[PDB]
Amino acid sequence: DPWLASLSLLPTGWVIGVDPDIGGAIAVLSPDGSSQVFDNPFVHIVVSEVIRKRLDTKSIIQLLRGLDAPPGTTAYIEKSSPFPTDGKQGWWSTGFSYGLWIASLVASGFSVVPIASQTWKAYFGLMRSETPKDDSRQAASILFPDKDQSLKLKKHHGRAEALLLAAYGKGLVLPSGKFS
Amino acid sequence: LASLSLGWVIGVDPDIGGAIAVLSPDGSSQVFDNPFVHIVVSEVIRKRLDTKSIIQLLRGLDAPPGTTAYIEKSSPFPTDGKQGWWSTGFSYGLWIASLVASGFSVVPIASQTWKAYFGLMRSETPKDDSRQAASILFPDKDQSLKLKKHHGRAEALLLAAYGKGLVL
């Protein structure tokens, strides 16, 4: 698989998960069971007389260089899937975000593995619900309870997806119920 | 631009079929085609840039850290479709992050800005004319610019020429 082999400097207990969109996050899981999650750094920019948000390339790379996760850690990234109602600039921007993140991760020595959103959601049973965004924050808070206050707002949906992608990569199991 | 930085000049044409040029203080020039891999979409093979190979290439360049890399300011092409807009931004972000992560400063330059600097703004055959302009500025590249497919090498060289301040 030439595409997957191009996503790591290395041939093909830390895990990284990245939701690469504006509004996304990066989660880092340590072998000792602790977790960290960071909002994706962005700037406001004017394109064709419209103010928009764009990922901050330098800040992403500086964040990555501050992590304690060593090279050779696998970074699971959600496979890009722009929305239909997005225009010209939005499809460009989603691709830009994806390329920024992939190159940044590879240059830090991480092995990038793209995962379709349907794949990691099905792994956690995050299907068939009218409230998928709320459910992803609930799921992440069950798996990473010390993040419960960092996931309590609707806008923390991106932190939740990043943690769940990392949980997927680590093979963590979400229990059937409160007392399971 | 501030988010794009941590006698040498780099110029980059970021697309598939693009290239990266390096100009050294001693007048010499190098140009390298963009490495790519094949991915399968539906039952058809498409090309994507090769991230691992790009990073290895940048790390092996003679230019020292802090060298500025000039690149055409990327915009979605109006007549492209959605997949093309995505691909344009993807290739651009891959290159921007690779350059920044490898210690270079990126300076995006508007298309009409660098083309006007070489009199290419009022050009009806821009690919052919860029190869001719590049071959005049870098005569030791004349043999690497003589095919139609070499217009990516030419853009990379002309962006670096713009950044170094060479005159046609």
Q: Exposure of A25 by Cβ count < 10 A (0-12 exposed, 13-18 middle, 19+ buried)?
A: buried
Residue A35, φ and ψ in degrees, nearest 5: -140, 150
Cβ atoms of A52 and A93 within 8 Å: the answer is: yes
Distances (CA, A) of A98 to A114, B126, B163: 10, 30, 28
Length of chain A: 180
Q: Bridge-partner residues for B36, per DSSP?
A: B49
In the block, residue with structure tokens 């004319």:
B129
Nearest Cα to Cα of residue A12 among B42, B14, B17, B51 = B51
Determine if residue B91 is left, alpha or beta; phi over 0 gives left, psi from -120 to 50 gives alpha, anything else beta. alpha
Determine whether A22 is exposed, middle or buried from the number of CB atoms within 10 Å of its CB (0-12, 13-18, 19+). middle
- Cβ atoms B34, B19 nearer than 8 A: yes
Query: Phi, psi at residue B37, to the nearest 5°?
Result: -130, 165
**What's the full length of chain B, in residues?**
168
Does A102 contact B55 at a Cβ distance shorter than 8 Å? Answer: no
How far apart (Å, rounded) are the C-alpha atoms in residues A14 and B103?
26
Residue type, A124: F
Question: Would you call B101 an interface residue with chain A, using a CB distance cutoff of 8 Å?
Answer: yes
Minimal Cα–Cα distance from A144 to chain B, Å? 31
Distance of alpha carbon A30 from alpha carbon A144, whole angstroms: 12
Q: Return d(Cα B134, Cα B56) in angstroms, integer.
A: 26
Judged by CB atoms closer than 8 Å, whether chains meet at A2 and B89 is answered as no
Structural domain total, chain A:
1
Q: Does A113 touch chain B (CB under 8 A)?
A: no
Rg (CA), chain B: 15
Q: Name the minimum distance, in Å, from the CA of A125 to any CA of chain B.
A: 27
Distance from C-alpha of B89 to C-alpha of A95, rounded to nearest angstrom: 5
Four-residue CA torsion sign, A120, A122, A125, A127 = positive
Please report, as a single letter, which amino acid is at residue A159: R
B60 shares contact with chain A (CB less than 8 Å): no
Contact B117, B165 (CB under 8 A): no
Rounded CA separation A168/A173 (Å): 8
Dist. CA B77–CA B92, nearest whole Å: 13
HSE-CB of B4 using CA atoms within 13 angstroms:
19
Q: Do B52 and A95 touch (CB under 8 A)?
A: no
How many contacts, defined by CB atoms under 8 Å, are there between A and B?
A: 125
* Among B39, B55, B75, beta carbon nearest to A106: B55
> Could you tell me where the DSSP H helices lie in B63-149?
82-101, 111-117, 126-137
Question: Is residue A97 within 8 Å of residue A22, measured between CB atoms?
Answer: yes
Q: Contact A158/A147 with Cβ under 8 angstroms?
A: no
Range of the domain at B83: 1-168
Q: Do A96 and B93 touch (CB under 8 A)?
A: yes
Task: Classify residue A174 by burial, with Cβ atoms within 10 Å: 0-12, 13-18, 19+.
Answer: middle
- Give the tokens for residue A38: 């960071």
Q: What Å resolution does this PDB entry report?
A: 1.9
- Tell me the residue ranges of DSSP E strands in chain B: 9-13, 19-23, 29-33, 36-41, 44-49, 68-72, 105-109
- For an interface test with A, the pick among B47, B48, B51, B105 (most A C-beta atoms closer than 10 Å) comes out as B51
Helix (H) or strand (E) holding A37: strand A35-39
Nearest Cα residue to A112 out of A74, A147, A82: A74
CB contact under 8 A, B98 and A88: no
Amino acid at A112: V
Contact A24, A165 (CB under 8 A): no
Helix (H, G, I), strand (E, B) or coil at B70: strand
Experimental method reported for this structure: X-ray
Provide φ and ψ at A116, rounded to 5°: -65, 145
The sign of the dihedral angle between the CA atoms of A28, A124, A130, A146 is negative
Of the partner residues A2, A60, A106, the one whose CB lies closest to the CB of residue B37: A2
List Cα–Cα distances, B130 to A92, B117, B163, in angstroms.
25, 12, 16
Q: Do A100 and B93 touch (CB under 8 A)?
A: yes
Instruction: Mark yes or no for CB contact A91/B86 under 8 Å.
Output: yes
Residue contact A89–B76, C-beta within 8 A: yes
What are phi and psi for residue B32, nearest 5 degrees?
-130, 135
Chain B CB contacts of A104 below 8 Å: 97, 101
- Chain B residues whose beta carbon lies within 8 Å of the beta carbon of residue A88: 76, 78, 85
Evaluated on CA atoms B158, B85, B90, B105, the torsion sign reads: positive
Q: From A89, which residue of chain B is nearest by alpha-carbon distance?
A: B76
- How far apart (Å, rounded) are the C-alpha atoms in residues A70 and A168? 19
In sign, the C-alpha dihedral spanning B129, B135, B141, B144 is positive
A75 touches chain B (CB under 8 A): no
Neighbouring C-beta atoms of residue A169, cutoff 10 Å: 22
Taking chain A, what is the end-to-end CA distance rounded to the nearest angstrom?
Answer: 40
Strand-pairing partners, residue A51, are: A46
**CB contact set of B34 (below 8 Å; sequence gap of 6+):** B13, B14, B15, B16, B17, B18, B19, B20, B49, B54, B152
Work out the end-to-end distance of chain B between its first and last CA atoms, rounded to an integer number of angstroms.
27
Tell me phi and psi for residue A18, to 5 degrees.
-130, 125
The CA distance from B142 to the nearest CA of chain A, in Å, is: 32
